[PDB]
Amino acid sequence: VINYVEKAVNKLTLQMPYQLFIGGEFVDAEGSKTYNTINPTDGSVICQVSLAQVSDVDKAVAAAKEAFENGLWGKINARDRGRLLYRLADVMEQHQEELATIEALDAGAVYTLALKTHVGMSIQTFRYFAGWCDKIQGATIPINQARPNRNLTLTKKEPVGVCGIVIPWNYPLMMLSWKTAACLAAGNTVVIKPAQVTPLTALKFAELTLKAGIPKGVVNILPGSGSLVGQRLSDHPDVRKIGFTGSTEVGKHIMKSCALSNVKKVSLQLGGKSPLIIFADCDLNKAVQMGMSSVFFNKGENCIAAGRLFVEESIHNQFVQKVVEEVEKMKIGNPLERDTNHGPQNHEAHLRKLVEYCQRGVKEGATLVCGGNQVPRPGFFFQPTVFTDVEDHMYIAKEESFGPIMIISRFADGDVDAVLSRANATEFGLASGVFTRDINKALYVSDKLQAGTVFINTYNKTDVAAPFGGFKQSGFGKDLGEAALNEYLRIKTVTFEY
Amino acid sequence: VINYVEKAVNKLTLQMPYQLFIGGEFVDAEGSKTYNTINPTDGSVICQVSLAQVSDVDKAVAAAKEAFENGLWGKINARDRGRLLYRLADVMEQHQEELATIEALDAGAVYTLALKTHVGMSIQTFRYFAGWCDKIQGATIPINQARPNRNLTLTKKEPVGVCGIVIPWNYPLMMLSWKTAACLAAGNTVVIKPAQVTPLTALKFAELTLKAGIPKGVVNILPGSGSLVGQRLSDHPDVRKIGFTGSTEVGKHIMKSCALSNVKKVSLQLGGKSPLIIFADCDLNKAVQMGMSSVFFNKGENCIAAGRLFVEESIHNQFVQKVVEEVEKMKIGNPLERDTNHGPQNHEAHLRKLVEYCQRGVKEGATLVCGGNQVPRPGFFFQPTVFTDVEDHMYIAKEESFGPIMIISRFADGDVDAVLSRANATEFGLASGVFTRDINKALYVSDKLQAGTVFINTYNKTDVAAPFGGFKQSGFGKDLGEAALNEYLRIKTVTFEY
Amino acid sequence: VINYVEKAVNKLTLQMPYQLFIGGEFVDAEGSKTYNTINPTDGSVICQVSLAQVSDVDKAVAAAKEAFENGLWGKINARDRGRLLYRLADVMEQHQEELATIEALDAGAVYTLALKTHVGMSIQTFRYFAGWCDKIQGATIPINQARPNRNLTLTKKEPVGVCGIVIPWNYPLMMLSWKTAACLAAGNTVVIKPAQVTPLTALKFAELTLKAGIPKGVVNILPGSGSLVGQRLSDHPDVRKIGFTGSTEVGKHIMKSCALSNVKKVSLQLGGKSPLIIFADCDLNKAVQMGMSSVFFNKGENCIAAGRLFVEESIHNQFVQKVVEEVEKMKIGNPLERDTNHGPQNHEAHLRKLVEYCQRGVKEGATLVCGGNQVPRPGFFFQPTVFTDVEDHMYIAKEESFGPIMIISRFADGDVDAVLSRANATEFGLASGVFTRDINKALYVSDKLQAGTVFINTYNKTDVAAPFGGFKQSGFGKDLGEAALNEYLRIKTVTFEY
Amino acid sequence: VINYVEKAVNKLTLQMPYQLFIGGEFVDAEGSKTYNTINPTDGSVICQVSLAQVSDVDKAVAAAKEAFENGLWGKINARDRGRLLYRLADVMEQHQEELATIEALDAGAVYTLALKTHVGMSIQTFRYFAGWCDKIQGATIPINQARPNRNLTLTKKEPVGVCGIVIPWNYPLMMLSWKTAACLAAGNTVVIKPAQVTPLTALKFAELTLKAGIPKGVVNILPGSGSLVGQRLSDHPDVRKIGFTGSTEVGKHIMKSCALSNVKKVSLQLGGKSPLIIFADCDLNKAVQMGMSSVFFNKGENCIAAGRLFVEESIHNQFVQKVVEEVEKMKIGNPLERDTNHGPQNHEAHLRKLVEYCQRGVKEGATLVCGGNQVPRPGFFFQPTVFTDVEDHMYIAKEESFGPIMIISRFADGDVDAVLSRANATEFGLASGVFTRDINKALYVSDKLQAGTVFINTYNKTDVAAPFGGFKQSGFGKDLGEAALNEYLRIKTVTFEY
Numbered sequence A, B, C, D: 001v002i003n004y005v006e007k008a009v010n011k012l013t014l015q016m017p018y019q020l021f022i023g024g025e026f027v028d029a030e031g032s033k034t035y036n037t038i039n040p041t042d043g044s045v046i047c048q049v050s051l052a053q054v055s056d057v058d059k060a061v062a063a064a065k066e067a068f069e070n071g072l073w074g075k076i077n078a079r080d081r082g083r084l085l086y087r088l089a090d091v092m093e094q095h096q097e098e099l100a101t102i103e104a105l106d107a108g109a110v111y112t113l114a115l116k117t118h119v120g121m122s123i124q125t126f127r128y129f130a131g132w133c134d135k136i137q138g139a140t141i142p143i144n145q146a147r148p149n150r151n152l153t154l155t156k157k158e159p160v161g162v163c164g165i166v167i168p169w170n171y172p173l174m175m176l177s178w179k180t181a182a183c184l185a186a187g188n189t190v191v192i193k194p195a196q197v198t199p200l201t202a203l204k205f206a207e208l209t210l211k212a213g214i215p216k217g218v219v220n221i222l223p224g225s226g227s228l229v230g231q232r233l234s235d236h237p238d239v240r241k242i243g244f245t246g247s248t249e250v251g252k253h254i255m256k257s258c259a260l261s262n263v264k265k266v267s268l269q270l271g272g273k274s275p276l277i278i279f280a281d282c283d284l285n286k287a288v289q290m291g292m293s294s295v296f297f298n299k300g301e302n303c304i305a306a307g308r309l310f311v312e313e314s315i316h317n318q319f320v321q322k323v324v325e326e327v328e329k330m331k332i333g334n335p336l337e338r339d340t341n342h343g344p345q346n347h348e349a350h351l352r353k354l355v356e357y358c359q360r361g362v363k364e365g366a367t368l369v370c371g372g373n374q375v376p377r378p379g380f381f382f383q384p385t386v387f388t389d390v391e392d393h394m395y396i397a398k399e400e401s402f403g404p405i406m407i408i409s410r411f412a413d414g415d416v417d418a419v420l421s422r423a424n425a426t427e428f429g430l431a432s433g434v435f436t437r438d439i440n441k442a443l444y445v446s447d448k449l450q451a452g453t454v455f456i457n458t459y460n461k462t463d464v465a466a467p468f469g470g471f472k473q474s475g476f477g478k479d480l481g482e483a484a485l486n487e488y489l490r491i492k493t494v495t496f497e498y
């Protein structure tokens, strides 16, 4: 019997765990400490959540270590670990309306989007990785033979062991699922730290691990602060790998802590300032649709959002006019209402950052075409924003907004290399995109863009089977695809002589 | 015209460059600073070598950046890059005696061993990776289709860009080759820092890159200190990846420096304390031969050296008697003489460390069965040493010697799990081995050993196709094999909608 | 509604379809022609089954073609084809008792075995292959560039189109499942011809595909003769691939027919005469247990059955004595009775072959230690048989029995090559095995055995992730594992210049 | 010494072996039978060549079988097999002018083209496959464990054994190289039958294998007839695999022969009627350059030649005018003149067929815009030909000419699916291309074309790393690329219990 916060909302009765999940049980933090999680649609407290302390991290890690070394998870067939993860995907899908409603409450995700992406992609992620379990394979390798003797050399793919996963607040359940699905399919056990401001879908996900029959200790979830709980995961001597998504600064600090403790493996998905180049020979009405989606999707709280749009000179004014016409049709609203297509920002501090960003944009001289302000209504809503006449030296040409602000620069007709050079002049390299009907330009621009993902005539088209990760200061290592498994496996080489 | 230090020795004329190699030219360091390199066979100065400073590191990085971004290396076909690397392997083979002779003078490597391993394995490495260049392939991925439209997703494998490689002194040419062949096969450019005490085969290799036609800037070599040159390569904003082999403490510091500068990728091959478990049912004579080799190969200055031997109770005394008989047969002496099979230690400070190490083993209670001291002859020779009665809590049971010191413990007849536990009780996890004629026990032990390489009925059997790298605090990432390439490549995902 | 033959048996009410399955529906054959299917436990008629004619085949091929070119199967995402195959496996699981009872009636499979293998391995096969759908990937390849232009080259893995699958009677549902799971996972559609004597689980399977939602025409099932229905599948100009398992002679004829019609692709899994070599140093009691299993599993009706046991001279007589003891404990009976462990032979003509085989064995001089005859009871039961003093020139040392007949030769102590030579002196090369505790012997024998599969210290250990197929006259191509997908996919190379 | 036909030509003194090559030696055929090989530039006899008989094929197969089972080729490391194949490529490069001269004389290949393609690509093929030898790798597979025991499953890639290679006359040395490089890289030995009409570069290549140190018997070459030598190779009980390139009818009879002997493996590269679709938004002058090359390259004797061009209605007439302007600039003449761009057809009977083919195209109503006839000059030159007003039911719209005959049809502006239907209405499926600047068309067209290779905005762009092979009646299996290796390897599954 679990304690729940019960809430009747969206024609459902939600049952939300709110405690730490350690060793297959929900338990209070040390000294029963708690904190409040806030609903961004009206500013209210949703409920109190356990606030993990250092001694709770140590309990979670111990539980994970025990589950890995002596529990069932380390003894079952790869195929049977697969069945458990498939079953976990079924359980999530049976609770999909509920998880999507929690995410609407906790994170501001518009409900219909949350059902299809926040939740629907997490379910795809578990199913996808469940199918890898018994298809992760090593090699047999034709090495030189120590004649007159013989040699056989093979590699075995083994789990790393206990991992810690630290994730951000923009897609709480989906980021959790990206990393956890690959981590568990590889045979590891895990301690997860959701972002403090968005713990609830993680804790409900935890309960679902019980329903799916995941052995106790395999998954542990610790709502709590980065500087305390995240830091202790990075320093812990029994943790063998950290997977991190979040900002560049915090990723530097996590990589440093992995170094100074036990050289634990790390992967990092860090910030972006992703460019989208739109040529005059593109399909203009699709460029406007996909151009808006690259900025406004998920209220701009999107790791791969296009952070600059470069638009060729001859279509630039017509492009801005069409975007303004579509912007005006967007419906801002409570994320639980069916007609809503733009929900609130995730939390108050982030809303404050966005207001300040756009003041700085106006102050340094860009043209504010629309938006820029907090919407007058309760909660933390931000008006979709369009800036034009952005120049390369401006702050908003360099800094990632993580909000629904479209930042447009022009480039001269016929220029390809000059616009590439401005798109690549950033220390980030997470994503990028190009719109053009011309196959030669599309192939040449996708070769020259210095980013982990290049979208061509589309944007935001991620897929559980297509690896996602950045270059340069956006980090290294992939989530999704077969590539994500290599972060959670190690290779043992075995060489016989006979 | 290159300046050389010329020397008649070993039936050849050595022509040794002694300057920095930057942008395809040998140059003095800033201020013409220099340092001496010392011949371990007699303590004498071989010659003066330029001493790279921070502004030389900057010069080497800029030439590597320019060779990558604009020079011919970044434009030729992958297949033509492979031709240039095969040609470099051919030029190395044409100079094989001269390379091996330099290695005997600079590092103390016995000549006949340097010919077959230091040099011979380097040549194999470049020919192996040269064959990879036009076989490195990305993927096409069956993603979900945004109906009524279609999607095509592919991955491209691309070079990471400028790399820094920092290597230890135990196999100067071979460690450089392992990392540099995989780095260059992937299409990168590189700045290499050899261990300060062993620069000379690296600078001769630099000269061979000119004879092979490798474009200027692709390879840059900076003899100099880790605390100055290595440090600046780890800090540099234009270096994108660091490959490192060396001690655990230095690899922690490098990883930390990668994090605090620009999140550069990093691979680490670090210390080891590798266990070799010898069961009573092995072929005993062969266990002696291979057990000696696991300790004494290359005067024990060998990353995968067995740091402990566990010998089953009922064969322990007979194994120790036969080892002592074979150690009496070893011929210690000048590495250029054909009968030598035990050359000097690499440099004086390391000889001192081994003298102290064996003092500590004696002090804490282990039985010194032979050796323990400097050999009374010029240069830095150390006696092949055997300790018995070693107990798990002893410093010599935990610390890596990196010298020709065989460290023997017993284990009870029919124990398997108990000896495994003792073999695994270390934060290292680089290599390991088991001798047994019993198939079940061999397979089971290899599963249970927590190390990146497990040898079965052999030892030291590395191969350019077989990935090599450690677990836990021995680091991460592979050298050799196809797996090595992944440290030097990045993956770009490209998604079209049409 | 579907017509069923209803049968109360094994505490279930079986509902068995008995018509052709074409285009999503059960229909009579042309002219309403039918034939009887025979219960091997008593010789009685289970029921009448539609007897496909040429016009039926053409219809089935037409429906498969339309389903591939225009139907839903050809349009859905690979991921959603995978979900359908996993739902199919779930539905087979919900009917596992029923399927295993049908297979007990139709093929004489002992019910407890059929539940674990015939049916339980079928379910594993569909789940394994379902996971492959969205993980089948092509390549991007670094070809030479047509400077000053660029080139991109990729490969796409596509379905081959309409396939025909012709299977034997020994594991009717499991052989169907092996091939169909890989065929459908690769995106193809299929016409399946079960062995005429065992149509019933295939027909039941057909019904299950309707329950699982597989689009109509993707799976079509035609009970009927090889010489008529199988032959027309091999000749048909719209079938693009045949997958075949059965005898070598029919395999040759199907290959020839593929060639003369439209060069359709073909895979073949043909006979075997698989040797098992048992050395004096093996675990003897285990060798008896696994040696018994290698011959008598599934009444000897087992493609991978060891057809010759070679037993080292010093343990031969004691091996034979222990085999006779275990043979005497076998309970021969009705496959529905729980204590049975040896069921009847599949059909009468096969029983006659086995009687003639053992007559020839006795005639040519082998020693008959037990069995050799039809058991005195209704049905087609065959007494488990052991022959010793088998010499390499004897018919029964060359020809595959497919029956519960253990065929034993000696080899001299210490011989390894000489027994390899005898074990390899056959035109077949399907499976093989070796029992020995010696690692060096096991690795060497497994290198020298000329067979698709080598078991070491076990036998009959097939796995749905492990590819299974023959060398020489046992055919080519694999079922099971990633390799099986290659028979059902084609590779298209796309090369752009830009 | 080897007997040569000596000929002073092209500034060289060619030395051409003319005998059978069996077991490392040039020998006369049985009864000293010989036949003439004919220079197509003037109809003269070049020399007499041995004419292999049945007993000569048996000798070559015996020598290939001994070389594989007992000789050095079966025992050396995979890496050292690769060094010998890279040494063979170097010897071919040292003789490249003499090989290209022999191909100009024997096959009519224009010398400058024979240097870069017939010869230059053969050299790239041996270098590329030489790099695969020590990178062919098997797998280790996470099967279910037979608890309380453990299982290890691995696969080994092994050579198939003795192979027969049967090749056509259009690129004598290059088709030999494509199949032989991959066959030998995988470890096999081979008997090669070159086209009877073009034996000479094959025999010169056999002599190069001696200079490269390939062990005697690993390569055997038997000039003579398909129906005698080729037939006996396909029937031979010790040949395990046939690699064939040529016409559909012969490929069907070969596959039937493999089936009726010993189920040997077979790969088949058969005819083509490859379509090239030129849209109105292409780059027109390039389309004309590439369109011309798609047909006329190597005098149309080119397995991937475009056999139909479809040109969108609004550019058709301008396309044809530009074609005729280009064809008028083609210089026809002796293949040694360095301005020749159009050499003679390969032999007399093929020229005759081209004359009949064109008479037939005029007769059925197509418009002859130029050519259609033998050029009046000694030898077998055929005039470059252009047909317009070709309709889908015509013989020349269905049958492959294999000659320099451009076959053009219009298709309607804006149709895409309709021209695709017509491009796909053939039982061939070897190659195809599309010229268009529009990315959406190029991608959609490449997905819908039913051909093993699709070129986009280029043609004839084959590459040793990019697999090449047909669909439908164009056969199956690939040459080139990693995929070619799989035709020449078998997979052994080895499964342990411990």
Ligand SMILES: NC(=O)c1ccc[n+]([C@@H]2O[C@H](COP(=O)([O-])OP(=O)(O)OC[C@H]3O[C@@H](n4cnc5c(N)ncnc54)[C@H](OP(=O)(O)O)[C@@H]3O)[C@@H](O)[C@H]2O)c1
Pocket (backbone or CB within 6 Å): B166, B167, B168, B169, B170, B193, B194, B195, B196, B197, B224, B225, B226, B227, B229, B230, B231, B232, B234, B245, B246, B247, B248, B250, B251, B253, B254, B269, B270, B271, B272, B302, B303, B304, B400, B401, B402, B430
């Ligand atoms: N098993 C292994 O794979 C492995 C390999 C090598 C060594 N070891 C262990 O380490 C010991 C060797 O000691 P060591 O002091 O010679 O090795 P080390 O300090 O780890 O040196 C390795 C390389 O790192 C460089 N380096 C030092 N500080 C650096 C910094 N701050 N930034 C960048 N690079 C830096 C060194 O330069 P300098 O030339 O100035 O020192 C040297 O080239 C051995 O006794 C052995 O136990 C283990």
